[PDB]
Design an enzyme around this catalytic site. Structure first.
Site, PDB file in Angstrom:
ATOM      1  N   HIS A  83       3.933  10.885   6.188  1.00 19.76           N
ATOM      2  CA  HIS A  83       3.232  10.734   7.560  1.00 19.76           C
ATOM      3  C   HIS A  83       4.320  10.001   8.468  1.00 19.76           C
ATOM      4  O   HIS A  83       4.634   9.065   8.129  1.00 19.76           O
ATOM      5  CB  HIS A  83       2.011   9.868   7.509  1.00 19.76           C
ATOM      6  CG  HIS A  83       0.640  10.613   6.779  1.00 19.76           C
ATOM      7  ND1 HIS A  83      -0.256   9.778   6.096  1.00 19.76           N
ATOM      8  CD2 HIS A  83       0.454  11.731   6.731  1.00 19.76           C
ATOM      9  CE1 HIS A  83      -0.928  10.549   5.817  1.00 19.76           C
ATOM     10  NE2 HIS A  83      -0.321  11.795   6.076  1.00 19.76           N
ATOM     11  N   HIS A 121       0.749  -1.367   0.056  1.00 12.88           N
ATOM     12  CA  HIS A 121       0.067  -0.013   0.010  1.00 12.88           C
ATOM     13  C   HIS A 121       0.683   1.272   0.049  1.00 12.88           C
ATOM     14  O   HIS A 121       0.418   2.267  -0.234  1.00 12.88           O
ATOM     15  CB  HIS A 121      -0.978   0.082   1.073  1.00 12.88           C
ATOM     16  CG  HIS A 121      -1.678  -1.108   1.468  1.00 12.88           C
ATOM     17  ND1 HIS A 121      -2.828  -1.902   0.552  1.00 12.88           N
ATOM     18  CD2 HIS A 121      -1.587  -2.282   2.179  1.00 12.88           C
ATOM     19  CE1 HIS A 121      -3.213  -2.851   1.054  1.00 12.88           C
ATOM     20  NE2 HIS A 121      -2.383  -3.170   2.103  1.00 12.88           N
ATOM     21  N   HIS A 181       6.136   7.010   6.255  1.00 14.98           N
ATOM     22  CA  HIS A 181       5.419   6.571   5.002  1.00 14.98           C
ATOM     23  C   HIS A 181       4.931   7.544   4.315  1.00 14.98           C
ATOM     24  O   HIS A 181       4.870   8.745   4.765  1.00 14.98           O
ATOM     25  CB  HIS A 181       4.573   5.154   4.991  1.00 14.98           C
ATOM     26  CG  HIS A 181       3.202   5.721   5.492  1.00 14.98           C
ATOM     27  ND1 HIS A 181       3.104   5.847   7.156  1.00 14.98           N
ATOM     28  CD2 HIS A 181       2.144   6.227   4.966  1.00 14.98           C
ATOM     29  CE1 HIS A 181       1.784   6.338   7.199  1.00 14.98           C
ATOM     30  NE2 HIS A 181       1.368   6.428   6.167  1.00 14.98           N
ATOM     31  N   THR A 230      -5.797   6.698   8.032  1.00 11.10           N
ATOM     32  CA  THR A 230      -6.549   7.186   6.712  1.00 11.10           C
ATOM     33  C   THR A 230      -6.437   5.519   5.795  1.00 11.10           C
ATOM     34  O   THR A 230      -6.627   5.609   4.736  1.00 11.10           O
ATOM     35  CB  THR A 230      -5.841   7.802   5.686  1.00 11.10           C
ATOM     36  OG1 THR A 230      -4.398   7.597   5.539  1.00 11.10           O
ATOM     37  CG2 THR A 230      -5.752   9.216   6.803  1.00 11.10           C
ATOM     38  N   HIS A 271       1.989   8.946   0.811  1.00 10.69           N
ATOM     39  CA  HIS A 271       1.091   9.031  -0.044  1.00 10.69           C
ATOM     40  C   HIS A 271       1.466   9.659  -1.446  1.00 10.69           C
ATOM     41  O   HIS A 271       1.768  10.742  -1.221  1.00 10.69           O
ATOM     42  CB  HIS A 271      -0.485   9.296   0.417  1.00 10.69           C
ATOM     43  CG  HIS A 271      -0.681   8.382   1.828  1.00 10.69           C
ATOM     44  ND1 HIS A 271      -1.325   7.236   1.832  1.00 10.69           N
ATOM     45  CD2 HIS A 271      -0.174   8.646   2.908  1.00 10.69           C
ATOM     46  CE1 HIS A 271      -1.308   7.019   3.097  1.00 10.69           C
ATOM     47  NE2 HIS A 271      -0.822   7.736   3.848  1.00 10.69           N
ATOM     48  N   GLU A 301      -3.140  13.420   0.935  1.00  3.34           N
ATOM     49  CA  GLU A 301      -4.590  12.990   1.593  1.00  3.34           C
ATOM     50  C   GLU A 301      -5.339  14.255   2.172  1.00  3.34           C
ATOM     51  O   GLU A 301      -6.408  14.632   1.544  1.00  3.34           O
ATOM     52  CB  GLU A 301      -4.151  12.098   2.642  1.00  3.34           C
ATOM     53  CG  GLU A 301      -3.531  10.503   1.981  1.00  3.34           C
ATOM     54  CD  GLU A 301      -3.820   9.418   2.909  1.00  3.34           C
ATOM     55  OE1 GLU A 301      -3.483   9.647   4.174  1.00  3.34           O
ATOM     56  OE2 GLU A 301      -4.338   8.501   2.287  1.00  3.34           O
TER      57      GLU A 301
END
Ligand code: P7H
Ligand code: ZN
Length: 257
Positions: free
Chosen positions: A116, A61, A91, A195, A93, A103
């Site tokens: 994050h 992910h 990590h 999230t 996104h 996000e």
């Protein structure tokens, strides 16, 4: 298994994780004109000098860098928080193109990516216990825009070819997360959730106002990762972001005027 695609993405998550439709879900749009300056908010204390990174991992992910959280070596305190929160991992996104990937949004603006740094409250002893508590986790969110390179990110970028597919990991010692931080620690804060599944409502969000700049070459390397395991059809790890969720009965507070 949940993911980010048409048949298993964010709009499906509520079936396995009904809290997806809860009262304090993340991320949210940060409407900068409505966020209230709170002069009672303290400066954020980021104490990362003794951080011990351990491993870098493609979890199917995102990718994450994991830290030794068995002692108070890399801790977040102050700001909106009561007590001490240990850094477990960071990590990202990111998007398929630079106009999406974050996000959180700021006045509906999407950034190319969002970092994050995930911390858990030491009073609960372990992260699994902390996710069951409304003040269990503190996630420090940092926006990425594309422009100049971030030198402190390059060590991360350079090992991504070794963790291309889901399940792969590598040694990742002596990485200093201070090299990922912007100048200012001015922030917005609100009560929210993870999230990703399990979407637990356990997070105090701290979102920095100042983005970091990364280069196009740096973000291109994120986009060469794969959601799939080795031997499975290749699906680029891109657009691994959950969209903004309803604010409902929450107030976003600003640390700055
Ligand atoms: N985008 S985000 O909200 O920072 C999600 C980070 C992913 C996780 B954070 B908490 B922290 B814990 B759960 B959540 B997942 B990894 B890191 B670590 C997690 C796995 C354990 C959650 S459980 N299944 O024990 O309730
Ligand atoms: Zn995240």
């Amino acid at each position: 298994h949940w993911g980010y695609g048409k048949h298993n993405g964010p709009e499906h998550w509520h079936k396995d994780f009904p809290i997806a439709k809860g009262e304090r879900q993340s991320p949210v749009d940060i409407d900068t004109h409505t966020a209230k300056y709170d002069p009672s908010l303290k400066p954020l204390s980021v104490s990362y000098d003794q951080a011990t990174s351990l491993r870098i991992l493609n979890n199917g992910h995102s990718f994450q860098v994991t830290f030794d959280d068995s002692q108070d070596k890399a801790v977040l305190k102050g700001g909106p928080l009561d007590g001490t929160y240990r850094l477990l991992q960071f990590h990202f996104h990111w998007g398929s193109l630079d106009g999406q990937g974050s996000e959180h949004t700021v006045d509906k603006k999407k950034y190319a990516a969002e970092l994050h740094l995930v911390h858990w409250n030491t009073k609960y002893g372990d992260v699994g216990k902390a996710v069951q508590q409304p003040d269990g986790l503190a996630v420090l969110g940092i926006f990425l825009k594309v422009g100049s390179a971030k030198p402190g990110l390059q060590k991360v970028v350079d090992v991504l070819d070794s963790i291309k597919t889901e399940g792969k990991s590598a040694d990742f010692t002596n990485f200093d997360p201070r090299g990922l931080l912007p100048e200012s620690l001015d922030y917005w804060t609100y009560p929210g959730s993870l999230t990703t599944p399990p979407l637990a409502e356990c997070v105090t969000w701290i979102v920095l106002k100042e983005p970091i700049s990364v280069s196009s070459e740096q973000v291109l390397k994120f986009r060469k990762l794969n959601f799939n395991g080795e031997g499975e059809p290749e699906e680029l790890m891109v657009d691994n972001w959950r969209p903004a969720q309803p604010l409902k009965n929450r107030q976003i507070k600003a640390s700055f005027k």
